[PDB]
Enzyme design. Structure first.
Site, short mmCIF file in Angstrom:
data_model
loop_
_atom_site.label_atom_id
_atom_site.label_comp_id
_atom_site.label_asym_id
_atom_site.label_seq_id
_atom_site.Cartn_x
_atom_site.Cartn_y
_atom_site.Cartn_z
N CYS A 48 18.66 2.67 -1.22
CA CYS A 48 17.85 3.72 -1.86
C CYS A 48 18.49 4.37 -3.08
CB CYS A 48 17.49 4.81 -0.84
SG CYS A 48 16.37 6.14 -1.45
N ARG A 105 18.53 8.75 -3.56
CA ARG A 105 19.26 9.63 -2.66
C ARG A 105 19.80 10.96 -3.19
NH1 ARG A 105 23.33 5.55 0.16
NH2 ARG A 105 23.02 4.41 -1.80
N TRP A 137 8.68 9.78 -3.37
CA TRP A 137 7.75 9.50 -4.47
C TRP A 137 8.19 8.21 -5.15
CZ3 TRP A 137 10.46 14.26 -4.55
CH2 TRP A 137 11.59 14.31 -5.38
N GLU A 179 8.49 0.11 -9.07
CA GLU A 179 8.04 -0.38 -7.77
C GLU A 179 6.59 -0.87 -7.87
OE1 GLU A 179 9.38 1.85 -4.14
OE2 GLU A 179 9.60 3.50 -5.60
C1 HEM Z 1 12.47 11.01 -3.61
C2 HEM Z 1 11.93 9.78 -3.89
C3 HEM Z 1 12.61 8.59 -3.64
C4 HEM Z 1 12.74 7.59 -4.56
C5 HEM Z 1 12.33 7.63 -6.04
C6 HEM Z 1 13.21 6.45 -3.85
C7 HEM Z 1 13.24 5.14 -4.45
C8 HEM Z 1 13.47 4.01 -3.71
C9 HEM Z 1 13.33 2.70 -4.23
C10 HEM Z 1 13.09 2.27 -5.67
C11 HEM Z 1 13.71 1.86 -3.23
C12 HEM Z 1 13.54 0.34 -3.24
C13 HEM Z 1 12.14 0.04 -2.64
C14 HEM Z 1 11.80 -1.44 -2.67
O1 HEM Z 1 12.22 -2.15 -3.62
O2 HEM Z 1 11.11 -1.90 -1.75
C15 HEM Z 1 14.12 2.66 -2.12
C16 HEM Z 1 14.57 2.14 -0.88
C17 HEM Z 1 14.70 2.88 0.25
N1 HEM Z 1 14.56 4.27 0.34
FE1 HEM Z 1 14.22 5.55 -1.09
N2 HEM Z 1 13.42 6.74 -2.47
C18 HEM Z 1 13.03 8.06 -2.35
C19 HEM Z 1 12.94 8.74 -1.12
C20 HEM Z 1 13.29 8.19 0.10
C21 HEM Z 1 13.17 8.87 1.34
C22 HEM Z 1 12.52 10.24 1.60
C23 HEM Z 1 13.78 8.10 2.27
C24 HEM Z 1 14.12 8.39 3.62
C25 HEM Z 1 14.05 9.63 4.21
C26 HEM Z 1 14.10 6.89 1.61
C27 HEM Z 1 14.55 5.72 2.30
C28 HEM Z 1 14.79 4.52 1.67
C29 HEM Z 1 15.17 3.35 2.41
C30 HEM Z 1 15.57 3.33 3.92
C31 HEM Z 1 15.07 2.31 1.53
C32 HEM Z 1 15.14 0.80 1.86
C33 HEM Z 1 13.70 0.30 2.16
C34 HEM Z 1 13.65 -1.18 2.57
O3 HEM Z 1 14.73 -1.74 2.86
O4 HEM Z 1 12.54 -1.77 2.60
N3 HEM Z 1 13.83 6.93 0.24
N4 HEM Z 1 13.94 4.01 -2.38
N1 DP2 Z 2 9.86 5.25 -3.15
C1 DP2 Z 2 10.16 4.73 -1.95
N2 DP2 Z 2 10.29 3.42 -1.86
C2 DP2 Z 2 10.62 2.63 -0.65
C3 DP2 Z 2 9.54 1.52 -0.51
C4 DP2 Z 2 9.98 0.45 0.53
C5 DP2 Z 2 9.06 -0.79 0.53
N3 DP2 Z 2 9.81 -1.95 1.02
C6 DP2 Z 2 9.27 -3.23 1.07
O1 DP2 Z 2 8.09 -3.44 0.69
C7 DP2 Z 2 10.17 -4.36 1.57
N4 DP2 Z 2 9.79 -5.64 0.91
C8 DP2 Z 2 10.07 -4.59 3.07
C9 DP2 Z 2 11.18 -5.46 3.68
C10 DP2 Z 2 11.08 -5.32 5.20
C11 DP2 Z 2 11.40 -6.63 5.96
N5 DP2 Z 2 11.10 -6.38 7.39
C12 DP2 Z 2 7.76 -0.53 1.36
N6 DP2 Z 2 7.69 -0.80 2.67
O2 DP2 Z 2 6.77 -0.12 0.86
N7 DP2 Z 2 10.34 5.50 -0.87
N8 DP2 Z 2 9.94 6.79 -0.76
O3 DP2 Z 2 9.72 7.52 -1.80
O4 DP2 Z 2 9.77 7.25 0.38
#
Ligand code: HEM
Ligand code: DP2
Ligand code: HEM
Ligand code: DP2
Ligand code: H4B
Ligand code: H4B
Ligand code: MTL
Ligand code: MTL
Ligand code: ZN
Lengths: 407, 410
Positions: free
Chosen positions: B108, B111, B280, B285
């Site tokens: 993420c 963070r 958000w 994305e």
């Molecule tokens: C404030 C806005 C936030 C932004 C802009 C942000 C942005 C992102 C982006 C660009 C990714 C990659 C998503 C992808 O390529 O599928 C990511 C991954 C992730 N974010 Fe954040 N995030 C935010 C908030 C959060 C929140 C609130 C949580 C948890 C409480 C969080 C948990 C994660 C996790 C666990 C991943 C990995 C998801 C996966 O492996 O599919 N994010 N985030």
């Molecule tokens: N801005 C974000 N972005 C996080 C988005 C994560 C995205 N991952 C995927 O689509 C992975 N390919 C899923 C891989 C899972 C394999 N089991 C999903 N499930 O939509 N978060 N927040 O703002 O909360």
């Protein structure tokens, strides 16, 4: 274990067994991944030589042959007697071609088998090295129709008579620190640019000055040489729509030629082994031209494009980046100098991976380096899982000479 | 042991000691790096130690390590575990745990915002309608009329593995995908399998290009139930372009609230299988992956055609050109509708500042370079030049198998 690699775009899955032949450490551990870190005796030698010879004889379909066995003993006796050994020409060619084949960070390996190898192991002086390099440059440049090549100088003996090319690439632009505190030319070579001066070179103090070669033979001090300008193919950069582009005054050289790496074959170390292929567009347009620490031209280009540079969200850097990269490709193709765009190069690599997996059982690849530095996910390698591991023969980084040379 | 991390653009070197507290495996060995591999009932025994580690971290965080409150809690938990085989977290601990699972999420880039997370405690929830109500409340609070607020809703933790709470959707809000008999796909290809399950469960699909999927909710291990999110709660943004008036006619739009709903949250050895969270979007994305992945909406050609770019040869970089404009369009639309969004330059710049702050106040910041670097303009963002160390810290968010593959139907 037998690892599998999946491409998340095509769903194609490949199984990797080649990694099971890896020997050297990766830098990672079960607890921490270091995938993004840029740089993580007679007794020692025979094992290395044996591993190498075995794969060579295996590659020529003579594994276990008397010829194989015979050679094994000869080298064995040679190491026991001379503490080292010499490679047969055939083994030398196979080794260099394979060090490229094994370069996990190179995206253009589909071309690995076509490498022209120049044996310079009979070289003895810096002037001799200058001659060989000139010949390499001319051969590889080939009037714009680039051809891959490597020139291999004498192997390390006692480490006190090492052959070294002090330059990073045979051809690069100088960099000078100016009063403004600013940097003129290429910031990446500021230190080398100074050492040439500190050694005699007369710097034109320009923006794109081809640096002189600083060659070291048999451990002796290095000597300067000017590559015949007629041998350095350069490309003026213009855009196919922005007539003002040319006024930027940009140009790049057509021959990319890493000169400071170390080639290891059968335990033998070749400290001076310049090699060259041809450029992938992004290397120049994205990294050389747009890196903040390089020519960093985005702002000037953005200005000449007249776009709102007030807010990052207008993506003016992204817009400009694409244009700069279109212009690099356009110019090279216009002047008939070989060059490949990131889309074609990555597509070829994917093809190469498939060939490798089925003909060799795998292909070490470093994702962090293979994915182009612009438009990552619209290239296929972004979606391709890759396994990184180290196989020899190999190309490795080595300390810069000026930090080890005993004048 | 100290580990150095260097930024090749600023020469700034940082020292990591936090990795020492990493207990879980990475998938890598001293012989092979799996850095780009997408994904390489506990017993009373392996539970108390996990609880203890967590509580020690919690109490130390509140500057009460070794306190009587601290020792009493540890004794209280061990007894509960011995007596009931599990234990309940205090509200303060759940909040702390949730925030840290985000703080520890190495993939993420957003963070820097971790400490500002609104935690909704849904542990008293017992049915699917209860889940729906909770989720609706989460969507309205988070959306906040376009001024997005980070939130996570936490449903009952796993007990025996037979009574799991699960949100079958991948995100609370996503568009349906339909495989057509001619082999083509209508809508988002990414959700085709889930869409078919919804239809099979009774959903009447509008069969359009941007149909908001229904929620499929599983409470207490019972079969999942369908619910439609009130339309007035689903904020969407029509995508137009600042200079290309023909862009809007592409008929594109996207939802404003990204809310991952299928990950597993681990806190002190306890497993929360239903923990939807949302923050958000970072523009790329939507603009790079959702719209331009070949396996997603794949709109590069149609956009490139309208821009009348030379598509005869890749070296004209028509794809790269179309890509930028589309991404410009996504950011422009969200900003114009006043729906929170962040661009990749802004987001990566913040992550670097956050990362440096973490090294200084925590001794590290696990980060996955492969995921952190944006899918476009990689090297013109600072993260590209930033060395990173990837390791796993708990509390954590983990992938878990899709429920339809494990669920025992009643
Ligand atoms: C404030 C806005 C936030 C932004 C802009 C942000 C942005 C992102 C982006 C660009 C990714 C990659 C998503 C992808 O390529 O599928 C990511 C991954 C992730 N974010 Fe954040 N995030 C935010 C908030 C959060 C929140 C609130 C949580 C948890 C409480 C969080 C948990 C994660 C996790 C666990 C991943 C990995 C998801 C996966 O492996 O599919 N994010 N985030
Ligand atoms: N801005 C974000 N972005 C996080 C988005 C994560 C995205 N991952 C995927 O689509 C992975 N390919 C899923 C891989 C899972 C394999 N089991 C999903 N499930 O939509 N978060 N927040 O703002 O909360
Ligand atoms: C045919 C053209 C070739 C293409 C298009 C190609 C392309 C690339 C690219 C894009 C890089 C990344 C460069 C960087 O970011 O610094 C690279 C690295 C590398 N390539 Fe190739 N390559 C080619 C030929 C060669 C040849 C001939 C060899 C060796 C015989 C080779 C060995 C390597 C090595 C060792 C690296 C890593 C260098 C480093 O770590 O700095 N390449 N290649
Ligand atoms: N097309 C190519 N490209 C390879 C270019 C490699 C590049 N590496 C670098 O600039 C690393 N950052 C140097 C870091 C070394 C650490 N000591 C360099 N030396 O300029 N090859 N062909 O031969 O075709
Ligand atoms: C820190 C990170 O490893 C570093 O910036 C890497 C990323 N990927 C790269 N990829 C290529 N091809 N070349 C590079 O110089 C780099 N630099
Ligand atoms: C194979 C490779 O690991 C895969 O395509 C990864 C690369 N980086 C990514 N980065 C982010 N943020 N999101 C992704 O889905 C991916 N996919
Ligand atoms: O100016 C000298 C630099 O180019 C040199 O120190 C390089 O960083 C080194 O050769 C590795 O590429
Ligand atoms: O259509 C079902 C898919 O969306 C589903 O399998 C997801 O890929 C998975 O839940 C991870 O996001
Ligand atoms: Zn690794």
């Amino acid at each position: 274990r037998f690892l599998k690699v999946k491409n998340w775009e095509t769903d194609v899955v490949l199984t990797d067994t080649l990694h099971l032949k890896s020997t050297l450490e990766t830098g990672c551990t079960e607890h921490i991944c270091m995938g993004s870190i840029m740089l993580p005796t007679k007794d020692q030698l025979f094992p290395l030589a044996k591993e190498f010879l075995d794969q060579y004889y295996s590659s020529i379909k003579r594994f276990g042959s008397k010829a194989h066995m015979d050679r094994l003993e000869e080298v064995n006796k040679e190491i026991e007697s001379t503490s080292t050994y010499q490679l047969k020409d055939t083994e030398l060619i196979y080794g260099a071609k394979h060090a490229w084949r094994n370069a996990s960070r190179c995206v253009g390996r589909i071309q690995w088998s076509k490498l022209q190898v120049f044996d310079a192991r009979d070289c003895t002086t810096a002037h001799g090295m200058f001659n060989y390099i000139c010949n390499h440059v001319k051969y590889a440049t080939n009037k714009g129709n680039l051809r891959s090549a490597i020139t291999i100088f004498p192997q390390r003996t006692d480490g006190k008579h090492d052959f070294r090319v002090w330059n990073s690439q045979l051809i690069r632009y100088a960099g000078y620190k100016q009063p403004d505190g600013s940097t003129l030319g290429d910031p990446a070579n500021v230190q080398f640019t100074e050492i040439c001066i500190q050694q005699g070179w007369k710097a034109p103090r320009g923006r794109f000055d081809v640096l002189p070669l600083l060659l070291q033979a048999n451990g002796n001090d290095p000597e300067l040489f000017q590559i015949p300008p007629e041998l350095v193919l350069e490309v003026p950069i213009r855009h196919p729509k922005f007539d003002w582009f040319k006024d930027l005054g940009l140009k790049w050289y057509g021959l990319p030629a890493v000169s400071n790496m170390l080639l290891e074959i059968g335990g033998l170390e070749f400290s001076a082994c310049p090699f060259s292929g041809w450029y992938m567009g992004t290397e120049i347009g994205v990294r050389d031209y747009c890196d903040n620490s390089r020519y960093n031209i985005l702002e000037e280009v953005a200005k000449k494009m007249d776009l709102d540079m007030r807010k990052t969200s207008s993506l003016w850097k992204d817009q400009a980046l694409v244009e700069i990269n279109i212009a690099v490709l356009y110019s090279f193709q216009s002047d008939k100098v070989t060059i490949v765009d990131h889309h074609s190069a990555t597509e070829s690599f994917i093809k190469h991976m498939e060939n490798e997996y089925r003909c060799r059982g795998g292909c070490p690849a470093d994702w962090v380096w293979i994915v182009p530095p612009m438009s990552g996910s619209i290239t296929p390698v972004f979606h391709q899982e890759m396994l990184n591991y180290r196989l020899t023969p190999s190309f490795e980084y080595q300390p810069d000479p000026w930090n080890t040379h005993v004048w």
